[PDB]
Amino acid sequence: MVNPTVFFDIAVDGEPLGRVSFELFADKVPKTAENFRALSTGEKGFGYKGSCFHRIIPGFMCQGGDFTRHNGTGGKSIYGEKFEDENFILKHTGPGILSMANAGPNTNGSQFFICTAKTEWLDGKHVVFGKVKEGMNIVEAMERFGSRNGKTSKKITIADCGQLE
Ligand SMILES: Cn1nnc(CN(Cc2ccc(N)cc2)C(=O)NCC(=O)N2CCC[C@@H]2c2ccccc2Br)n1
16 A cells, blocks of 8 residues: 655764665565565565675666675575566666666566666666655765775665664
């Protein structure tokens, strides 16, 4: 009946920065939304708490969710190491969009990105499953620690995360 909301509390070299919350589009991409919800709560015994944003390209996006290898080579879903592209209904319409990173068709795990620009070239090959609800300003503050090749100048972490309400 109503889409779930999750939060990240972000820190920069261990110092609190602020809270980002996300609406998850369970009404359109239930399986993909549920994966991200569950990794956010930690209810399977693993998830996003303590993981880093390993690649931030200002004017493009912030990428994270690699809680196994910390560098963009890892992660897993709650269904198995990988799961399918659920659908490509939703498009990358502008800043704030939450979408799955991948390495080929039907290779989703835990890695995700938050768009800081419209990224229409990703439509139809990356599954869009949510958007930033509050704290887009905190995403903009994070983005400033990225660089052209994505390497971050300070360590950007999910200090805490879970489900709101
Ligand atoms: C060097 N490196 N840093 N991170 C990665 C991770 N990665 C591959 C990958 C994704 C998900 C799983 N489960 C396993 C692997 C990746 O960034 N794939 C591309 C991708 O998903 N995206 C989404 C937005 C940014 C990035 C991208 C997509 C398309 C063009 C450029 C770029 Br950069 N690899």
